[PDB]
Design a protein around this ligand. Structure first.
Ligand SMILES: C[C@H](CCC(=O)NCCC[N+](C)(C)C[C@H](O)CS(=O)(=O)O)[C@H]1CC[C@H]2[C@@H]3[C@H](O)C[C@@H]4C[C@H](O)CC[C@]4(C)[C@H]3C[C@H](O)[C@]12C
Ligand SMILES: C[C@H](CCC(=O)NCCC[N+](C)(C)C[C@H](O)CS(=O)(=O)O)[C@H]1CC[C@H]2[C@@H]3[C@H](O)C[C@@H]4C[C@H](O)CC[C@]4(C)[C@H]3C[C@H](O)[C@]12C
Ligand SMILES: C[C@H](CCC(=O)NCCC[N+](C)(C)C[C@H](O)CS(=O)(=O)O)[C@H]1CC[C@H]2[C@@H]3[C@H](O)C[C@@H]4C[C@H](O)CC[C@]4(C)[C@H]3C[C@H](O)[C@]12C
Ligand SMILES: C[C@H](CCC(=O)NCCC[N+](C)(C)C[C@H](O)CS(=O)(=O)O)[C@H]1CC[C@H]2[C@@H]3[C@H](O)C[C@@H]4C[C@H](O)CC[C@]4(C)[C@H]3C[C@H](O)[C@]12C
Ligand SMILES: CCCCCCCCCCCCO[C@@H]1O[C@H](CO)[C@@H](O[C@H]2O[C@H](CO)[C@@H](O)[C@H](O)[C@H]2O)[C@H](O)[C@H]1O
Ligand SMILES: CCCCCCCCCCCCO[C@@H]1O[C@H](CO)[C@@H](O[C@H]2O[C@H](CO)[C@@H](O)[C@H](O)[C@H]2O)[C@H](O)[C@H]1O
Ligand SMILES: CCCCCCCCCCCCO[C@@H]1O[C@H](CO)[C@@H](O[C@H]2O[C@H](CO)[C@@H](O)[C@H](O)[C@H]2O)[C@H](O)[C@H]1O
Ligand SMILES: CCCCCCCCCCCCO[C@@H]1O[C@H](CO)[C@@H](O[C@H]2O[C@H](CO)[C@@H](O)[C@H](O)[C@H]2O)[C@H](O)[C@H]1O
Ligand SMILES: [Ca+2]
Lengths: 229, 229, 229, 229
């Protein structure tokens, strides 16, 4: 169309995409100030008014660029994200949870979508994630199995830490991060169950070894790429 | 045999091995629910009945596939494991410790045996372990030597941490993981023995250095393999 | 000039640059003793007298070598540093903050400027920093976004940790370092907000993954250099 | 000599060196039991008698093999070690400190000297240490500079942590290991000095970055060796 091409050379234009990047950064400062109580008592109104100005601007633009690109728009990871955070954003406050108001703050991630240098590095990081899946598999299972013995051994006498399969899952996640694993968990346990270290000193070893391998794994696969290039 | 070949094309068949993978996952959910007290009051019976249905199914199948494969079955790492967790499983409750009931939960690791993609990655992880043996050697010795001085210096005045060669071994294992090493151990010690940091700041250095090397070691040996391939 | 060349073969001479390296090390021992209260009661005077002897010596030499090298001197990173720590040093005590007196202690970093082997390794370390910028970018943004939800969710009931966008930034920096993240932060939170782990167990994962990549990233880029050499 | 060659084919013989490896392991078990109080009340005598049997055996053998090898013996790292732990060992108890009795326990490291596979890996680990010297240099200096400001800023109001240049050095060593750096140090400080995070959040960054580089450094230098081989 003699206009469909005038609409595309608008949307696909630099100024338009660079414009909503200046409207991203102007909004991220606003979210920053809006947490201030002092700022909110004075400049609260402008702000909440400013916040409606943008959301129609984006719904304008999410409408424009979904028209420009029709059904291709919907098989794009970045675009779908922009659709699903604007959508999230459009449903208003005091309806349902208000946790959605705090989730609205995800729309800042658009700056990663809109900025190419940023979508590059995010594609790097995600490019890594298929290779580690089998380890994440094995690993999840391993946690599962130990959550179950740990509950079965300790949940009745240590209910804050092991009375639930999830309570155990969590504590175990923490012990893996080595976070007060001894003085705060294993050591308190050996006051009652004195051979508790048999369960944890092995558990630490396996998940640390598995981690070390997971990482050497990334570093070797990052290397097949260099020699191949 | 005109049947030994009908028994092999059963056992070695996809549906049969994929069948006991669906009987693995159905059992792992059951172990999950069985930790719940609510679930156990209602659906306890079905469950404990379900648990006997499987164990005869596996002892059926561990019998079948030990017949199909005779004495080869017994020099296979995965198969031996399946024999030794089913065996563990067959001895019943309220005999000996009941810690064996919690050890029964190891039979979930069959999912790593039955799933090829999973036995692949487990063979990777174990493939690594010969190379690090000399470091694990040196390392064990080093811990040993320090357990002995640490007991000899601190066990009489700090018996929860150093009165035993093992008590020391453990605390030292913990200090290596940097887990409250200072605010919870070395610092409390310098209230009595003020030059205790002479023992620990060196000890941290050596075991951290040895670890860093152990890891660079894995990463270099993972590299001889790439250029060789 | 028949003297400009006699001034250059002084400044650019070994003995002159090696001289102010012996005047660096003599001064760093002095700063060391000067923290002692005993030393300061006796040898305080000599010392504070000694400290004025050097600062005129350096302002002598910073004047000489800025003359020898005119405006080239001012586009050199090491030289500019030497200018800006001597300058810092020249403004005296009891004027403004006295935090500048503690900042005077930065002039020890001249030993890294004056010693080539040392400016080599510092140029290595800084040589690394362009490549990680996009990750430091993404990363800063990510922290920002979570500071804002974390304040919005927890600052009213946990003001020491989340009542400020910065208070949150800090706590979050700490949680990233895994430092009492559970027993000291997330666990205290679940006494009031029981699904707080939904915010933190994801947050730990993302920033740990991003870190692992940041590091594998350094190691791969250090490798393009070897094959290229 | 018609005997100097009979003395060398003794010392240099397998059985002789393998003999004192069985006398090493028999002694290391003895040190292990000797920490037990029960064992020492019964079998104490045998033991302390056993301990004199070996020390003359080694002084026999350290005499033999210093004769076999004359002055070459004294420029060998492993041999010198064996001389200097036996020497340490020969001076008896209740003279000077008794800390030397606990230092006698170092003679177990002979097992690393006597076992080739073990002296191999120890030579690997030490082979690494020249390359990191410039970083250990820079690093020591950096710690030094911060010890001095940290004392100058905090030692008067926090004397257990910063009243000494060494007290500071230690605390700083601990903060580097991230060990309760926040909840136990920086956080307690901001109750008095509220912009203390300006000193520590930078300090953590620099020493973590320097560490990451130190390690990528080992991994790259371990790689020049592979392509060169
Ligand atoms: C491409 C990538 C890795 C292979 C590669 O090319 N480089 C290494 C991906 C693509 C397909 C992936 C697997 C399957 O989806 C399912 C599989 C079964 C487990 O039960 C659950 C996860 C497993 C291990 C997955 C991870 C595995 O890692 C694969 C092979
Ligand atoms: C193959 C592998 C490493 C060599 C390799 O090919 N790549 C590296 C394995 C195979 C044989 C291994 C050693 C011996 O069992 C005993 C030996 C004596 C110590 O007192 C205790 C452990 C030691 C160091 C073992 C570890 C060592 O690592 C070896 C050489
Ligand atoms: C050379 C180096 C990396 C490329 C390379 O050669 N090796 C990898 C440097 C040089 C120029 C750098 C970027 C720009 O200054 C701005 C850019 C936009 C972000 O919003 C903020 C930071 C970004 C990602 C910077 C980091 C990036 O990493 C670049 C490409
Ligand atoms: C061989 C090795 C590294 C070079 C190499 O071949 N591979 C990297 C070693 C051998 C000689 C070493 C230096 C000197 O003793 C003194 C020097 C001055 C500092 O003020 C204090 C330490 C410095 C940086 C030392 C470390 C440096 O690392 C060198 C070059
Ligand atoms: C952008 C999308 C991101 C999707 C994220 C995908 C999840 C990836 C899982 C990686 C994170 C696992 O979570 C984290 O793993 C590290 C591995 O460094 C482990 O952490 C522990 O062991 C490793 C051993 O290698 C050490 O490096 C680390 O210092 C220690 O704390 C813990 O298990 C946990 O802190
Ligand atoms: C599937 C079978 C598995 C068999 C397991 C074989 C055991 C292998 C030993 C490796 C585990 C040693 O146990 C663990 O080692 C790590 C090394 O990362 C050390 O951990 C500490 O030092 C290292 C330095 O490299 C850091 O990476 C780590 O963050 C820190 O906590 C501790 O010593 C201990 O937490
Ligand atoms: C000389 C000038 C220096 C300029 C400094 C530039 C800043 C560079 C940023 C690197 C430092 C980031 O700060 C530090 O990052 C490490 C990454 O190891 C993270 O630390 C955590 O995760 C990583 C996972 O890789 C683990 O290695 C580490 O043991 C764990 O504590 C934390 O986020 C923080 O402790
Ligand atoms: C056999 C002789 C041995 C001689 C020993 C020579 C000393 C070598 C110095 C290396 C040890 C430095 O001491 C240790 O360094 C590690 C680096 O992993 C740092 O540790 C911290 O930062 C690093 C970042 O890389 C992380 O890997 C680590 O999990 C974290 O705790 C600390 O600074 C200290 O725990
Ligand atoms: Ca900790």
């Amino acid at each position: 169309g003699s206009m469909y091409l005038r609409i595309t050379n608008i949307v696909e234009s630099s100024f338009f995409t660079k414009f909503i990047i200046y409207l991203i950064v102007l909004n991220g400062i606003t979210m920053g100030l809006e947490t201030s109580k002092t700022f909110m008592q004075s400049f609260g109104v402008y702000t909440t008014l400013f916040k409606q100005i943008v959301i129609t601007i984006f719904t304008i633009e999410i409408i424009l660029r979904i028209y420009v690109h029709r059904i291709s728009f919907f098989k794009d990871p970045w675009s779908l994200f922009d659709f699903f955070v604007v959508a999230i954003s459009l449903v208003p406050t005091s309806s349902g949870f208000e946790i959605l108001r705090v989730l609205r703050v995800l729309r800042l991630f658009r700056l990663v979508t809109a900025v190419p240098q940023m979508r590059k590095i995010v594609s790097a990081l995600i490019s890594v994630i298929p290779g580690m899946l089998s380890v994440i598999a094995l690993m999840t299972l391993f946690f599962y199995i130990f959550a179950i013995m740990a509950t079965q051994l300790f949940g009745e006498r240590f209910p804050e830490w092991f009375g639930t399969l999830g309570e155990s899952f969590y504590t175990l996640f923490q012990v893996m991060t080595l976070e007060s694993w001894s003085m705060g968990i294993v050591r308190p346990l050996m006051e009652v169950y004195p051979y508790a270290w048999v369960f944890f000193i092995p558990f630490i070893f396996v998940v640390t070894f598995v981690m070390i391998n997971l990482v050497v794994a990334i570093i070797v696969d990052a290397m097949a790429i260099l020699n191949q290039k």
